[PDB]
């Protein structure tokens, strides 16, 4: 088949499913993307925190909270969410509001916003206080008929249901906010180059950015005139600006140009390059014909940390004897085949899977001894071992779409746990450019 360069530039280069790309488009209509949160907490009747179910239509969370904070005259902090839902969509979620009574929110009537009291609690709603998110996505404008699409959906589903779900690939958005350069920067540092790792972040324009800022980076990218850059770069880019300043007093000090950014990107770059390698590996293994929900000799799995979450801490290695027991646990949801996120404390697997892992680090010319940045040790990671399959059991629904006469539409509704993304599920169903998505 065919995969966009955009996705091949970040390790991904195929599809666990051999079905045809459903194609089509998304977010054509606000209601075409419904996301309903699943809570993991309970509230009572007491507490200085009012808990409300927020339903918003085509609203940006920051904007909403900034609106409610003005109406209730409290700081933005007093209103928190468990997780930020998409603006262009119809989304429901739980939130908390400090020192506010039920009756007050019954008098607030904003456009495309619905507020419903759930109760009260002595505890605010912190990022993470939710189990998962129910989805109801709708793909429209497919070059197929309702009949040829429903059948196309059932096949894509079947393989999925059989393989256990969809690959746990690192989305194109994970490598960068608006510009996916993290992995590109983490690769230069490892190799030792700081002249490029710093420039790739300071400059290096992308077709996603406005031709204005796009021309600001392009400028210093071929002139290295950081003095001008600190004059053209919009204040919006604090990190890039902070770095150019360090380069005005300390010339050619690209090595320490990273000591201006907090612990955020500080380690995101290296983690990116890791996610990159991890993608490739996950593919090569999908090519080798070794499924993601079945163990083999020296496959290396993980177990849930007694919290219902797979952790790269306790990782038992499967052998020629425990193989029968390992696979038996997978179908019981107590183990998961994992893939390596290269570092300096990585434990390659053995057998066929071990060959794949070593075959990716080989062609890539990767060096485990390289994940120890000399200039920035704090920036050097030892590696981890993320799972491979992303549990998912979708339910499709095909048909004719009114908005696009002659074309068909698909209603994909499933659910994911906090930390996972819907694009990861959609890609196997639409198999289209991540930007056309």
Measured distance CA(248)–CA(256) in Å, rounded:
12
Cα 109 → chain centroid: 33
* Residue 274 within a domain: yes
Measured distance CA(87)–CA(6) in Å, rounded:
24
Q: Give the closest residue to 175 by CA, choosing from 256, 87, 265.
A: 265
| Burial letters 69-93, b for 16+ CB under 10 A, else e | beebeeeeebbbbbbebbbebbbbb
Q: Give the closest residue to 243 by CA, choosing from 256, 234, 231, 232.
A: 256
Q: Check whether residue 25 and residue 153 sit in a common domain.
A: yes
Asked which of 266, 301, 335 is the last residue of a domain, the reply is: 266
| Cβ proximity of 244 and 229 under 8 Å | yes
Inter-CA distances, 268 with 70, 156, 263, 265, 357, Å: 35, 33, 9, 4, 22
Q: Check whether residue 165 and residue 185 sit in a common domain.
A: no
* Residue 2 within a domain: no
Q: Check whether residue 47 and residue 15 sit in a common domain.
A: no
Q: Check whether residue 161 and residue 102 sit in a common domain.
A: no
Full residue range of the structural domain in which residue 146 is found: 9-32+130-175+267-435
Residues 6+ apart with CB under 8 A from 405: none
Query: Would you state the structure tokens that stand for residue 282, as one six-digit string?
Result: 């996950």
Beta-bridged to residue 301, according to DSSP, are: 337
| Burial letters 139-168, b for 16+ CB under 10 A, else e | bbbbebbbeebbebbeebbebbeebbbbbb
Inter-CA distances, 202 with 208, 239, 244, 372, Å: 16, 8, 7, 23
Inter-CA distances, 115 with 64, 68, 112, 278, 433, Å: 12, 11, 10, 42, 36
| Cβ proximity of 142 and 23 under 8 Å | yes
* Residue 279 within a domain: yes
Residues 6+ apart with CB under 8 A from 177: none
Question: For the CA atoms of the chain, what is the radius of gyration?
Answer: 24
Q: Check whether residue 167 and residue 99 sit in a common domain.
A: no
| Cβ proximity of 81 and 87 under 8 Å | no
| Resolution given for this structure, in angstroms | 2.6
Give the chain's domain count: 3
Q: Check whether residue 201 and residue 347 sit in a common domain.
A: no
Q: Check whether residue 76 and residue 111 sit in a common domain.
A: yes
| Burial letters 335-370, b for 16+ CB under 10 A, else e | bbbbbbbbbeebebbbbebbbbbeebbeebebeeeb
Beta-bridged to residue 114, according to DSSP, are: 55
* Residue 382 within a domain: yes
* Residue 4 within a domain: no
| Cβ proximity of 262 and 132 under 8 Å | no
Determination method here? X-ray
Measured distance CA(424)–CA(217) in Å, rounded:
31
Which is catalytic among the residues 18, 32, 58, 86?
86
* Residue 81 within a domain: yes
Q: Distance between terminal CA atoms of the chain?
A: 18
Cα 239 → chain centroid: 21
Asked which of 216, 249, 266 is the last residue of a domain, the reply is: 266
CATH of the domain at 121: 3.30.70.3160
Q: Check whether residue 91 and residue 236 sit in a common domain.
A: no
Please indicate whether residue 86 is annotated as part of the active site.
Answer: yes
* Residue 76 within a domain: yes
CATH of the domain at 305: 3.30.2350.20
CA angle 336, 338, 344 (to 5 degrees): 145
Measured distance CA(349)–CA(339) in Å, rounded:
9
> How would you classify residue 289: left for phi > 0, otherwise alpha for psi between -120 and 50, otherwise beta?
left
Residues 6+ apart with CB under 8 A from 138: 26, 28, 29, 31, 32, 33, 409, 410, 411, 412
SS3 of the chain: CCCCHHHHCCCCCCCCCCCCCCCCECCCCHHHEEEEEEECCCCECCCCEEEEEEEEECCCHHHHHHHHHHHCCCCHHHEEECCCCCCCCEEEEEEEEECCCHHHHCCCCCCCEEEEEEEEECCCCCCCCEEEEEEEEEEEEECCCHHHHHHHHHHHHHHHHHHCEEECCCCCCCCCCCCCCHHHHHHHHHHCCHHHHHHHHHCCCCCCCCCCHHHHHHHHHHHCCHHHHHHHCCCCCHHHHHHHHHHHHCCCCHHHHHCCCCHHHHHHHHHHHHHHHHHHHHHHHHHCCCCCCCCCCCCCEECECCCCCECCCCCCCCCCCCHHHHHHHHCCCCCEEECCECCCCCCCCCCHHHHHHHHHHHHCCCCHHHCCCCCCHHHCCCCECCECEEECCCECCEEECCCCCCCEEEEEECEEECCCCCHHHHHHHHCCCCCCC
Helix axes 182-191, 263-287, angle to 10 degrees: 90
Residues 6+ apart with CB under 8 A from 124: 49, 80, 96, 98
Question: Number of C-alpha atoms within 13 angstroms, CB side, residue 255?
Answer: 9
Phi/psi at 365 (5° precision): 60, 30
Count other Cβ atoms within 10 Å, centred on residue 330: 19
Strands 90-98 and 33-39: what pairing?
Answer: parallel
Measured distance CA(84)–CA(60) in Å, rounded:
9
Beta-bridged to residue 376, according to DSSP, are: none
Q: Check whether residue 302 and residue 430 sit in a common domain.
A: yes
Is the C-alpha dihedral spanning 93, 96, 101, 105 positive or negative?
A: negative
Q: Check whether residue 27 and residue 134 sit in a common domain.
A: yes
């Amino acid at each position: 088949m065919e995969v966009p360069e955009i996705e091949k530039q970040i390790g991904i280069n195929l599809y666990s499913t051999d079905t045809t790309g459903l194609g089509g488009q998304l977010r054509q209509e606000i209601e075409d993307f419904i996301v309903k949160e699943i809570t993991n907490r309970e509230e009572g009747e007491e507490g200085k925190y009012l808990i409300v179910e927020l339903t918003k239509r085509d609203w940006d969370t920051h904007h909403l909270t900034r609106t409610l904070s003005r109406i209730l005259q409290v700081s933005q902090k007093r209103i928190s969410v468990a997780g930020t839902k998409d603006k262009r969509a119809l989304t429901t979620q739980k939130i908390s509001i400090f020192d506010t009574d039920a009756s007050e929110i019954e008098k607030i009537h904003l456009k495309d916003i619905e507020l419903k009291v759930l109760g009260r609690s002595r505890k605010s709603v912190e990022l993470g206080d939710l189990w998962g998110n129910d989805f109801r996505i709708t793909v429209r404008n497919i070059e197929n008929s309702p009949e040829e699409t429903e059948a196309l959906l059932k096949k894509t589903t079947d393989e999925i249901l059989a393989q256990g779900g969809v690959p746990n690939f690192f989305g194109i958005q994970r490598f960068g906010s608006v510009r996916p350069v993290t992995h590109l920067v983490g690769k230069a540092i490892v190799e030792g180059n700081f002249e490029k790792a710093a420039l790739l972040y300071i400059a290096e324009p992308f077709p996603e950015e406005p031709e204005e800022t796009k021309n600001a980076r392009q400028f210093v990218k071929d002139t290295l005139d950081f003095k001008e850059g600190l004059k053209t770069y919009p204040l919006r880019l604090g990190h890039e600006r902070a770095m150019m300043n360090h380069l005005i007093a300390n010339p050619e000090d690209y090595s320490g140009s990273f000591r201006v950014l907090p612990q955020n990107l500080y380690r995101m770059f290296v983690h990116g390059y890791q996610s990159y390698i991890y993608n490739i590996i996950l593919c090569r293994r999908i090519e080798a014909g070794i499924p993601l929900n079945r163990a083999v000799e020296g496959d290396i799995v993980c177990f849930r940390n007694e919290v219902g979450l797979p952790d790269s801490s306790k990782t038992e290695k499967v052998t020629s004897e425990t193989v029968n027991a390992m696979n038996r646990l997978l179908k019981l949801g107590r183990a998961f085949i994992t893939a390596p996120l290269p570092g300096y404390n990585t434990e390659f697997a053995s057998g066929i899977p071990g060959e794949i892992e070593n075959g990716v680090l080989k062609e890539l010319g990767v060096s485990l001894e390289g994940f120890n940045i000399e200039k920035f040790p704090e920036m050097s990671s030892k590696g981890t071992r993320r799972e491979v399959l992303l549990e998912v059991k979708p339910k499709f629904e095909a048909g004719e779409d009114e908005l696009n006469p002659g074309k068909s539409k698909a209603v994909l509704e499933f659910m994911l746990p906090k930390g996972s993304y819907a694009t990861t599920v959609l890609r196997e169903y639409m198999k289209v450019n991540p930007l056309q998505m």
